[PDB]
Design a protein around this ligand. Structure first.
Ligand SMILES: CC(C)(C)NC(=O)[C@@H]1CN(Cc2cccnc2)CCN1C[C@@H](O)C[C@@H](Cc1ccccc1)C(=O)N[C@H]1c2ccccc2C[C@H]1O
Lengths: 99, 99
Protein backbone atom coordinates (compact mmCIF):
# COMPACT_ATOMS: atom_id res chain seq x y z
CA UNK A 1 0.00 0.00 0.00
CA UNK A 2 0.86 3.68 0.30
CA UNK A 3 1.38 5.31 3.70
CA UNK A 4 1.33 9.08 4.27
CA UNK A 5 3.35 10.74 7.03
CA UNK A 6 0.85 13.13 8.63
CA UNK A 7 0.80 10.66 11.50
CA UNK A 8 3.38 8.18 12.77
CA UNK A 9 3.50 5.28 10.24
CA UNK A 10 2.22 2.50 12.49
CA UNK A 11 1.49 -0.98 11.17
CA UNK A 12 0.42 -4.32 12.61
CA UNK A 13 3.08 -7.00 12.76
CA UNK A 14 3.01 -10.61 13.87
CA UNK A 15 5.97 -12.14 15.68
CA UNK A 16 6.21 -15.12 18.01
CA UNK A 17 2.57 -15.79 17.27
CA UNK A 18 1.77 -12.36 18.75
CA UNK A 19 0.23 -9.34 17.04
CA UNK A 20 1.75 -5.91 17.67
CA UNK A 21 1.85 -2.36 16.36
CA UNK A 22 5.21 -1.14 15.13
CA UNK A 23 6.59 1.99 13.48
CA UNK A 24 7.99 1.76 9.91
CA UNK A 25 11.30 3.56 10.39
CA UNK A 26 13.51 4.28 7.38
CA UNK A 27 15.99 5.86 9.81
CA UNK A 28 16.62 2.70 11.84
CA UNK A 29 19.32 0.33 10.49
CA UNK A 30 17.98 -2.44 12.72
CA UNK A 31 14.63 -3.58 14.07
CA UNK A 32 14.11 -3.08 17.80
CA UNK A 33 11.14 -4.46 19.68
CA UNK A 34 9.84 -4.01 23.21
CA UNK A 35 10.96 -6.49 25.86
CA UNK A 36 9.44 -9.91 25.15
CA UNK A 37 10.35 -13.53 25.85
CA UNK A 38 11.37 -14.96 22.51
CA UNK A 39 12.77 -18.47 22.62
CA UNK A 40 16.21 -19.24 21.24
CA UNK A 41 19.80 -18.26 21.87
CA UNK A 42 20.72 -14.59 21.57
CA UNK A 43 23.75 -12.28 21.64
CA UNK A 44 24.21 -9.19 23.87
CA UNK A 45 24.46 -5.92 21.96
CA UNK A 46 24.66 -2.14 22.19
CA UNK A 47 22.73 0.11 19.82
CA UNK A 48 22.75 3.88 19.79
CA UNK A 49 19.90 6.26 19.14
CA UNK A 50 19.34 10.00 19.65
CA UNK A 51 19.76 9.94 23.43
CA UNK A 52 22.56 7.43 23.80
CA UNK A 53 23.03 3.67 23.79
CA UNK A 54 20.87 0.89 25.20
CA UNK A 55 21.62 -2.77 25.82
CA UNK A 56 19.63 -5.17 23.68
CA UNK A 57 19.37 -8.89 23.01
CA UNK A 58 19.92 -9.91 19.40
CA UNK A 59 17.87 -12.80 17.99
CA UNK A 60 18.55 -14.08 14.47
CA UNK A 61 16.31 -15.68 11.85
CA UNK A 62 13.03 -14.67 13.44
CA UNK A 63 10.01 -14.96 11.12
CA UNK A 64 7.92 -11.82 11.24
CA UNK A 65 4.87 -10.71 9.28
CA UNK A 66 4.59 -7.00 8.52
CA UNK A 67 1.11 -5.94 7.47
CA UNK A 68 0.50 -9.29 5.75
CA UNK A 69 3.99 -9.49 4.23
CA UNK A 70 6.34 -12.27 5.26
CA UNK A 71 9.93 -11.50 6.25
CA UNK A 72 12.62 -13.14 8.35
CA UNK A 73 15.61 -11.59 10.01
CA UNK A 74 17.45 -10.23 13.00
CA UNK A 75 15.45 -8.52 15.73
CA UNK A 76 16.93 -6.72 18.73
CA UNK A 77 14.94 -6.85 21.97
CA UNK A 78 15.41 -4.21 24.63
CA UNK A 79 13.83 -1.43 26.73
CA UNK A 80 12.57 0.63 23.77
CA UNK A 81 9.53 2.91 24.14
CA UNK A 82 8.16 1.65 20.81
CA UNK A 83 8.53 -1.23 18.38
CA UNK A 84 10.72 -0.18 15.45
CA UNK A 85 10.85 -1.91 12.07
CA UNK A 86 14.19 -1.01 10.48
CA UNK A 87 15.71 -1.18 7.00
CA UNK A 88 16.89 -4.76 7.50
CA UNK A 89 13.26 -5.84 7.36
CA UNK A 90 11.81 -3.04 5.21
CA UNK A 91 14.06 -4.09 2.33
CA UNK A 92 12.53 -7.57 2.49
CA UNK A 93 8.96 -6.39 1.87
CA UNK A 94 10.03 -4.14 -1.00
CA UNK A 95 9.35 -0.95 0.93
CA UNK A 96 10.37 2.30 -0.76
CA UNK A 97 10.29 6.04 -0.08
CA UNK A 98 8.72 8.20 -2.80
CA UNK A 99 8.37 11.91 -3.52
CA UNK B 1 12.28 9.85 -6.99
CA UNK B 2 11.86 6.35 -5.58
CA UNK B 3 14.36 5.42 -2.88
CA UNK B 4 15.13 1.82 -1.87
CA UNK B 5 16.33 0.94 1.61
CA UNK B 6 19.30 -1.41 1.12
CA UNK B 7 21.49 1.56 2.00
CA UNK B 8 20.76 4.44 4.37
CA UNK B 9 18.37 6.91 2.66
CA UNK B 10 20.74 9.90 2.63
CA UNK B 11 20.13 13.10 0.72
CA UNK B 12 21.79 16.45 0.25
CA UNK B 13 20.06 19.39 1.89
CA UNK B 14 20.76 23.07 1.58
CA UNK B 15 20.25 25.36 4.53
CA UNK B 16 21.56 28.82 5.37
CA UNK B 17 23.27 28.67 1.99
CA UNK B 18 25.18 25.64 3.23
CA UNK B 19 25.25 22.06 1.93
CA UNK B 20 24.81 19.04 4.16
CA UNK B 21 23.92 15.36 4.17
CA UNK B 22 20.84 14.11 5.99
CA UNK B 23 18.84 10.96 6.60
CA UNK B 24 15.20 10.62 5.46
CA UNK B 25 13.72 9.32 8.71
CA UNK B 26 10.06 8.32 8.90
CA UNK B 27 10.43 7.29 12.55
CA UNK B 28 11.42 10.81 13.61
CA UNK B 29 8.54 13.21 14.37
CA UNK B 30 10.85 16.17 13.97
CA UNK B 31 13.88 17.34 12.05
CA UNK B 32 17.14 17.65 13.98
CA UNK B 33 20.52 18.76 12.66
CA UNK B 34 24.02 18.67 14.06
CA UNK B 35 25.10 21.77 15.95
CA UNK B 36 25.51 24.79 13.68
CA UNK B 37 24.70 28.50 13.48
CA UNK B 38 21.29 29.47 12.18
CA UNK B 39 20.16 33.09 11.95
CA UNK B 40 17.12 34.10 13.96
CA UNK B 41 15.98 33.47 17.51
CA UNK B 42 15.85 30.04 19.13
CA UNK B 43 14.11 28.55 22.14
CA UNK B 44 15.44 25.72 24.36
CA UNK B 45 13.67 22.40 23.90
CA UNK B 46 14.12 18.73 24.70
CA UNK B 47 13.40 15.68 22.57
CA UNK B 48 13.73 12.02 23.36
CA UNK B 49 14.21 8.72 21.65
CA UNK B 50 16.19 5.52 21.97
CA UNK B 51 18.84 6.09 24.59
CA UNK B 52 17.06 9.03 26.17
CA UNK B 53 16.51 12.80 26.01
CA UNK B 54 18.77 15.55 24.68
CA UNK B 55 18.68 19.37 24.72
CA UNK B 56 18.15 21.19 21.44
CA UNK B 57 17.63 24.72 20.07
CA UNK B 58 14.39 25.23 18.17
CA UNK B 59 14.33 27.46 15.09
CA UNK B 60 11.00 28.18 13.39
CA UNK B 61 10.12 28.79 9.73
CA UNK B 62 13.56 27.89 8.37
CA UNK B 63 13.72 27.40 4.58
CA UNK B 64 15.44 24.19 3.55
CA UNK B 65 15.92 22.48 0.22
CA UNK B 66 15.74 18.69 0.26
CA UNK B 67 17.11 16.97 -2.81
CA UNK B 68 15.67 19.83 -4.88
CA UNK B 69 12.33 20.20 -3.07
CA UNK B 70 11.58 23.26 -0.96
CA UNK B 71 10.22 23.18 2.57
CA UNK B 72 9.81 25.77 5.30
CA UNK B 73 9.34 24.58 8.85
CA UNK B 74 10.73 23.96 12.32
CA UNK B 75 14.34 22.85 12.55
CA UNK B 76 15.99 21.57 15.74
CA UNK B 77 19.75 21.82 16.32
CA UNK B 78 21.72 19.94 18.93
CA UNK B 79 24.04 17.03 19.86
CA UNK B 80 22.50 14.60 17.36
CA UNK B 81 24.59 11.66 16.06
CA UNK B 82 23.43 12.46 12.54
CA UNK B 83 21.26 14.92 10.58
CA UNK B 84 17.68 13.70 10.38
CA UNK B 85 14.80 14.96 8.25
CA UNK B 86 11.63 14.14 10.16
CA UNK B 87 7.94 13.89 9.26
CA UNK B 88 7.30 17.60 9.73
CA UNK B 89 9.37 18.24 6.59
CA UNK B 90 8.81 14.95 4.76
CA UNK B 91 5.09 15.75 4.59
CA UNK B 92 5.86 19.10 2.98
CA UNK B 93 7.72 17.50 0.11
CA UNK B 94 5.02 14.90 -0.43
CA UNK B 95 7.00 11.93 0.83
CA UNK B 96 5.26 8.56 1.28
CA UNK B 97 6.15 4.95 2.09
CA UNK B 98 5.30 2.35 -0.52
CA UNK B 99 5.38 -1.45 -0.59
C1 LIG C 1 18.56 1.09 15.53
C2 LIG C 1 17.87 2.25 16.27
C3 LIG C 1 16.51 1.97 16.31
C4 LIG C 1 18.38 2.19 17.65
N1 LIG C 1 18.18 3.48 15.56
C5 LIG C 1 17.84 4.78 15.81
O1 LIG C 1 17.15 5.13 16.78
C6 LIG C 1 18.31 5.83 14.85
C7 LIG C 1 19.52 6.52 15.47
N2 LIG C 1 20.19 7.63 14.71
C8 LIG C 1 21.46 8.09 15.29
C9 LIG C 1 22.66 7.13 15.39
C10 LIG C 1 23.11 6.78 16.68
C11 LIG C 1 24.21 5.89 16.81
C12 LIG C 1 24.82 5.37 15.65
N3 LIG C 1 24.43 5.67 14.31
C13 LIG C 1 23.32 6.57 14.26
C14 LIG C 1 19.26 8.68 14.57
C15 LIG C 1 17.90 8.24 14.00
N4 LIG C 1 17.37 7.00 14.66
C16 LIG C 1 16.09 6.67 14.02
C17 LIG C 1 14.87 7.20 14.77
O2 LIG C 1 14.02 7.13 13.67
C18 LIG C 1 14.17 6.40 15.88
C19 LIG C 1 12.98 7.01 16.63
C20 LIG C 1 12.41 6.04 17.71
C21 LIG C 1 11.27 6.59 18.49
C22 LIG C 1 10.04 6.96 17.85
C23 LIG C 1 8.98 7.50 18.62
C24 LIG C 1 9.15 7.67 20.03
C25 LIG C 1 10.38 7.31 20.67
C26 LIG C 1 11.43 6.77 19.89
C27 LIG C 1 13.36 8.36 17.31
O3 LIG C 1 14.47 8.54 17.85
N5 LIG C 1 12.38 9.27 17.30
C28 LIG C 1 12.49 10.58 17.94
C29 LIG C 1 13.13 11.72 17.12
C30 LIG C 1 14.21 11.78 16.27
C31 LIG C 1 14.58 12.98 15.63
C32 LIG C 1 13.87 14.20 15.85
C33 LIG C 1 12.75 14.24 16.72
C34 LIG C 1 12.36 13.08 17.36
C35 LIG C 1 11.29 12.64 18.32
C36 LIG C 1 11.11 11.15 18.26
O4 LIG C 1 10.14 10.72 17.30
Amino acid sequence: PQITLWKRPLVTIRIGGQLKEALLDTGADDTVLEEMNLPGRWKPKMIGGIGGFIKVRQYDQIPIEICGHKAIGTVLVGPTPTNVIGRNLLTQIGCTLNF
